[PDB]
């Protein structure tokens with residue numbers, strides 16, 4: 068399984084050629100507190116492309132966990148603000164057997180009853196005021212799913228872009244798989260928010276992938292090891308065109324990563340790779356990266372920071388391509404080399420999905436706002 072988060076059921080039609088889109092994100096509010104006593108989840112969609120695009124060719128697809136999807140009645144969102152375009156509906160896709168699927172669709176391009184201005188190629192675009200509306204309140208849905216099951220299998224989502232001219236194949240790199248936060252998620256609140264550059268980032272995400280053994284970067288510097296690796300892609304969506312070199316305060320910043328405590332003894336080497344969001348032909352394949360550091364994590368049993376690590380540099384641009392002065396996104400890649408094959412690891416462990424986090428902090432360990440991402444890797448219960 069080479070799918071993001073090891074997700075077992077999803078569309079895997081293949082890939083289009085690399086196009087000039089660079090970001091697509093789904094950002095739902097946490098399912099906490101009073102949200103549970105209602106029947107809605109609020110969200111926004113972020114999108115960015117680097118060269119003018121047009122037409123109904125480009126279709127955004129949103130997959131939701133089957134356990135939620137069974138109770139979804141309607142999903143709507145506003146297009147990017149501009150010329151008074153109207154609120155959009157995400158249309159549910161059905162199968163050939165008279166059943167709904169857990170995938171919804173809306174056009175990418177605003178002029179084609181979609182979300183994002185085709186001619187705008189600068190700052191990240193927002194489709195605001197998204198609402199998923201359910202048949203029942205979320206407390207009733209959570210009860211039916213079962214608290215135990217919500218603990219062991221996180222509620223997933225996947226957003227991605229397909230191209231009709233390419234037989235609905237996926238635009239590579241323009242996919243994000245995450246999970247809905249709930250009241251069992253507390254780590255984000257262990258972090259104090261920095262006052263430095265607090266309006267420079269819009270969103271952070273972490274995508275995960277199991278990569279095969281013995282693959283490498285083009286230059287040979289980076290690699291996955293004999294048992295493969297779990298790859299964490301920490302992606303930062305900018306608000307405008309941040310330059311670290313010119314504008315960062317509270318320097319030097321730290322790149323931070325946290326891996327599920329259960330996996331720590333099964334991770335050996337940890338590599339940091341520099342990755343680039345290309346203006347043309349966006350490509351973040353493993354081969355494209357370059358190894359920039361050997362990393363550590365906290366391995367002392369019982370330590371408050373168990374499974375966490377961080378790295379800095381007196382010039383952090385040596386480790387991270389910040390796409391300085393550009394609105395393009397940033398990808399920080401962590402390669403977690405496994406000590407044995409994943410199936411042996413799981414056998415030794417024998418359900419709870421594995422959780423990973425990443426964020427940037429200032430020199431005083433305070434979170435750079437909107438740079439925290441969390442992601443998961445699926446484990447069959």
Ligand SMILES: [Ca+2]
Pocket residue numbers: 219220221418419420445446447448
């Ligand atoms: Ca699980």
